[PDB]
RNA sequence: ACGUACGACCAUACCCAGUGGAAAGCACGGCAUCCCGUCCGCUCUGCCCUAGUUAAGCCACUGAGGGCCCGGUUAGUAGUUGGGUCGGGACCAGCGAAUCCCGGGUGUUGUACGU
RNA sequence: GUCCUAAGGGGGGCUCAUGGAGAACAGAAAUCUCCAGUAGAACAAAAGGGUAAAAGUCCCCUUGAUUUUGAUUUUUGUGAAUACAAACCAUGAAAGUGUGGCCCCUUUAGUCCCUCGAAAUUUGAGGCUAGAGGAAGUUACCACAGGGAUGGCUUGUGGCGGCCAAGCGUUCAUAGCGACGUCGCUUUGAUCCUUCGAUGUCGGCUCUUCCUAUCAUACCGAAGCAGAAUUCGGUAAGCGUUGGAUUGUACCCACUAAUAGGGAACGAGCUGGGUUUAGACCGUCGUGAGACAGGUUA
RNA sequence: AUGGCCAGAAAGUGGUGUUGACGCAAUGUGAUUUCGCCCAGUGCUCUAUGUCAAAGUGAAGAAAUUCAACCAAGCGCGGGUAAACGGCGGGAGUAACUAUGACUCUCUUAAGGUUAACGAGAUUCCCACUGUCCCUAUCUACUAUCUAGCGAAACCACAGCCAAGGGAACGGGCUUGGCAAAAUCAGCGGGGAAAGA
RNA sequence: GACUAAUCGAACCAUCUAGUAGCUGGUUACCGCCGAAGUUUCCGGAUAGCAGUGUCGACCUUCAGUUUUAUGAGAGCGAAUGAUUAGGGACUCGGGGGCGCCUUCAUCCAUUCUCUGUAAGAAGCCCUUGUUACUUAACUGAACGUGGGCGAAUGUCGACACUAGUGGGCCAUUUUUGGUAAGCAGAACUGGCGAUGCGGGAUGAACCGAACGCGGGGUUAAGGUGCCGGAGUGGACGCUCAUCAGACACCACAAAAGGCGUUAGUACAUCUUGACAGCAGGACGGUGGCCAUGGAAGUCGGAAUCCGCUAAGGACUGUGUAACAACUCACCUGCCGAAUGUACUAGCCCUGAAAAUGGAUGGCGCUCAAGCGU
RNA sequence: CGAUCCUGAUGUAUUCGGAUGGAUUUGAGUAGGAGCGUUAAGCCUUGGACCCGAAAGAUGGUGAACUAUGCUUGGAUAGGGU
């Protein structure tokens, strides 16, 4: 069925929040004895040509 | 959608397991259920994590998670 | 109420805070530290006082008779080699090893007797009350071997500090009562 | 034929602009005592038919007006009913539209009383 | 547990939603005035049908939102609705309109209701009438009565999305399909530190024949094919196409001219796995008999 | 022992028992060496209110009857028990009907420096050994074969050459072709037939 | 779960007992006369429909799977939504931090974006006349009677009783609704089959013709007439030669497909001012155009691509050189002699994909057919 | 005419009686009887029920000459190695 919510952004995040989240999560990967709680509910998707140039300039 | 997976050692098998024959997205941080308790089997070879998504106005195709 | 729409409209509730938007992304997370509870295998970096305390703890808390016997033997060997090598002290050593009189392990009881015999007599003397109370308990205890080994402990105490035993409060009449109760001479 | 009253079909009658209206009939009009109703005699109701005026209503005419209505065509076309040992849609026997376009119009009529 | 499941009748007067133009504060929005306004308002269906001197709104009186009997529709009894028939009314000057809202057990009562069957009374019961309320699994130890066991398909060249375009259509609409192509997603000769799920079963021995979709031998065409060794392709099935290793479960090695691919089974010859009667053990599940994610033995 | 576990329709009945805890009875584990915690749930077991049968008691009525207390065991409440079945942590903070959970904080541990002998048990390998194989050959006896005598059974709609077609992917009879010559013997296992199928 | 007399997850013997089965198998002479059926509707069953025997009633009324004429009807979504909030405020205890005071987030608000029925008569029509408690100002109307007068074509029964079988089968045309890569899945009417023989499709459940007592004569349908095979190597006009043509095609392969196969047409163009093809010659100058290159002169590359002499000739179509040269093409002239060229369209033909025992327009065979169209 | 509902007449064991009227359905009812016995056929129900066929259930008896275990009484089993 047609709906307005198909054509809207479903997940949004700001610059500072994304940068702080990435820095904190990288600091968490620095320690191998520290593991996340409820990792399935965390936005982990955000965390996770010389040959072409030469061929373009000289075929 | 589902095919019947037969289990047991007798000639008369049990047929409660269903295997998904179409591609699936199992989700993030997915660990398979114990074999005694999984009914719906989603094989590893049919799991996709990226798709070739085309932007309609930009007319470009990119591989997105 | 059985209808299942593709998108569910959130319902505003009065007197409650507004819900966060559907596109909101939460970056807060909590972490728990995994720790492996296993001691060092070589046990060589620790100081001799730390080995003394650890072996005393093993002697008083171990569930293996051979382990308790070896720990008491190690403590007895260090006390015999040097009485100055007692970081815990005579009072603490006595307080920890006096409940082991009632122990069912005869080898542990004999090694405890050796530890008592290698304790310094002038430090044994002021604390004759507690030792004699443990002797009374483990001596009226039901097991005959425990009674015999506790009598050996009482023999050691009478050899080392006789006057303190016969002059401490309850050292005379209560000991006589325990003797008469065990002998049937009541 | 023209008015008035009650009407039948209910836009060929409606809406927007102008122009004219013999005779009478309409209508606007004049006055608030009585009957009557209002914030207000605006509407309604009562009294006058004298005066004034066709200004408006109404009637008639006009408009390459909007709309509406009626014909030709479209078209024996689309479509549809049966037939073939017809082809890989066409014939046979028949029924049979509406658009688009081309034009026309812009009310008939009964009863009764009058001019 | 509280709350909502809707006020009908008669008569009379007036038009609604909205738009334009105006009035101290007053403006986008307070009240007032004119013009336009076919319902774009309202009527208890949010885009169904129907209503403009009303079926809407306001005012004045009123409860036809009343008894009684048949008929009809939805179709034995219902219930709802529809025209009435009789009585009692309401409203209006009157015509008229109004009979609603626009469309099987338990238990109670019966004076004059009837029985308890030899007669009567009192309790109780029964009847009739009128109401109110609301019984699990397993069988791999087995047995019986029966019934069964897509095809003139297929092959060599991806999908999605966008351009280009011969053409097909198309001139009272100038839309739509579209071959050939092209463009985006699916390591500077690397890495060897990414093997991604048996429900479906194949093999082997012996032996014969067929097909060509030709690996080799015969012949031929082309390629910087000097020679040698080849590569690509064509005609051709005459003639050959091997010996082994590995079951903690199909690829390696060697010889050779070459170690080509299939059919006749996979739409009652013999022999190893899928594979599984009865004995037994371990793992998972179940209180259990037992079953299985399974593994092993005879 | 006026007992435990069992038999019997019953019995002045019987087994253990001509027995007495170094015994009888019920179980689990299964030589020897080596080898914690929890009574949460389910069992088993020990000790005044609730639940509370029959008999008995009291009240009402003319009685049938109705209503009341009282009310054993069991269940419930409270303890024990894990070489019972099972299961694999604890405490504090927060909170304060009942049960729950959630949330932090902190300890988080029984086990480290005899596998022999025997076996028609299952598996891998090495030496020896060989017709298992390259790759088959030869010999003997008894059959099979022929003769004299004797002599069944299974099975049997009717019969037995194929090719193509015969919509119900069946054909030995139908259609169209190939064709096709008495009567026989030894083998053979393609087909038909044949498995207490 | 072994043994208990070849019998064991409850032995053997007799009886109840001819236990029960909806399941399996079978169910016995002939002729004659009728003769079927599959959601039609309701909650695994009833029921409509279709059939046969007896009757009875005036087997009276006539009706009809037909035509003609006249006239009518024709559930969900929602600017009541989905977003945006950087810049502006109110903020203050909303929360929290630091030192009652400030704050850092955060709270919101202010902003904005998104509209198929009926009729076609003798029971009908007309006149007169009554009855009424109905109705009307009124015998003014309403029905029902009294008396009298007078209709389209074509073809030619009803009610019971009893008893069945079948009542959610298959196939086909047409229509309608959904889809799929393609298949396909639903409904409605009609026809057929199950129940059915005959002639033709070589053969056959669904095709065509036609339905059936026992015979004789005649004529045909569908299909055929070279032989098997009864009937024409019949007649006319053409087309086609296939290295397994074609003679039963429509579906797939499969396309706007590929053919220097062969016919018939359509459109455009050239032509005695000489068409197409050939033969003999010209095919030039600025200029070796500009840039680049070791070299590049039309012909390794990039970009432009003009003018003159012209009858005509490209800043060049290929061969060629290291570069030139040279040859050639486009184009022009001379010889010649009359019709051609391009692209489509319609026929027939070839290819347009095939496995595995030896075989099929039915078989032989057929070539101005014994193939194809009339 | 019988059942159901409404009214309640003359009368009176003054609390019995139910006339006169109405209104609905109802009943194979009345409204100038049609039945009884019997014969033959079709159909239905119950019986073994058209015939043959279960694994079965129950009642009462017979078996330890096979075999399982136990009691009583008997019999038998070279030569080597350690």
What does the H/E/C string look like for chain B?
A: CEEEEEECCCCCCEEEEEEECCCECCCCCCCCCCCCCCCEECCHHHECCCEEEEECCCCEEEEEC
Q: Is the CB of C39 under 7 A from strand F?
A: yes
What residue in B sits closest to A46 (Cα-Cα)? Answer: B65
How, if at all, do strands B2-7 and B14-20 pair?
antiparallel
What residue in C sits closest to A14 (Cα-Cα)? Answer: C25
Cβ C115 vs Cβ C79: under 8 Å = yes
Question: What was the structure determination method?
Answer: cryo-EM
Cβ C164 vs Cβ C128: under 8 Å = yes
Contacts of A16 (CB under 8 A, 6+ apart): none
Chain breaks in chain B (C to N over 2.5 A) after: none
Chains B and C touch (3+ CB pairs under 8 A): no
Q: How far apart are CA C38 and CA C52, in angstroms?
A: 20
Angle at which helices C106-118 and C65-81 pack, to 10 degrees?
10
Residue-by-residue DSSP string for C101-127 = GG-S-HHHHHHHHHHHHHS-HHHHGGG
Residue C21 vs residues A7, C10, C16, C18: alpha-carbon distances, Å: 16, 10, 15, 9
Report yes or no: B9 at the A interface, CB cutoff 8 Å.
no
β-partners of residue B5 are B17
C1’ F197 / CA B36, Å: 39
Report yes or no: C23 at the A interface, CB cutoff 8 Å.
yes
Say which nucleotide is closest to residue B45, CA to C1' distance: E196
Query: Quick check: B29 and A45 CB within 8 A?
Result: no
Q: Is C99 helix (H, G, I), strand (E, B) or coil?
A: helix
| Closest Cα in chain A, distance from residue C141 (Å) | 51
């Amino acid at each position: 069925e047609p709906n307005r919510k198909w054509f809207t952004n479903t997940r949004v995040i700001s610059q500072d929040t994304l940068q702080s989240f990435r820095e904190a999560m990288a600091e968490k990967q620095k320690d191998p004895y520290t593991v996340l709680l409820k990792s399935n509910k965390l936005p982990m998707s955000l965390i996770r040509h010389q040959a072409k140039m030469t061929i373009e300039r000289e075929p | 959608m589902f095919k019947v997976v037969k289990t047991g050692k007798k000639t008369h098998k049990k047929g409660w397991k269903r295997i998904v024959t179409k591609p699936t997205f199992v989700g993030p941080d997915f660990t398979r259920r114990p074999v005694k308790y999984e009914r719906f089997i989603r094989p590893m070879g049919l799991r996709y994590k990226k798709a070739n998504v085309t932007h309609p106005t930009l007319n470009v195709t990119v591989q997105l998670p | 109420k059985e209808k299942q729409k593709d998108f569910q409209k959130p319902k505003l509730k009065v007197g409650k805070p507004k819900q966060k938007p559907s596109n909101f992304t939460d970056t807060s997370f909590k972490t728990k530290s995994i720790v492996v509870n296993q001691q060092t295998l070589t046990t060589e970096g620790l100081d001799s006082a730390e080995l003394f305390k650890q072996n005393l703890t093993l002697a008083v808390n171990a569930k293996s008779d051979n382990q308790r016997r070896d720990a008491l033997a190690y403590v007895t060997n260090q006390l015999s080699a040097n009485p100055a090598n007692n970081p815990v002290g005579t009072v603490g050593v006595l307080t920890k090893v006096l409940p082991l009189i009632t122990d069912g392990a005869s080898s542990v009881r004999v090694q405890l007797l050796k530890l008592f015999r290698t304790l310094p007599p002038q430090e044994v003397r002021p604390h004759a009350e507690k030792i004699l109370l443990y002797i009374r308990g483990g001596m009226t205890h039901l097991s005959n071997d425990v009674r015999t080994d506790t009598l050996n402990v009482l023999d050691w105490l009478l050899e080392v500090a006789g006057d303190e035993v016969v002059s401490c409060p309850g050292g005379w009449l209560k000991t006589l009562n325990s003797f008469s109760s065990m002998l049937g001479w009541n």
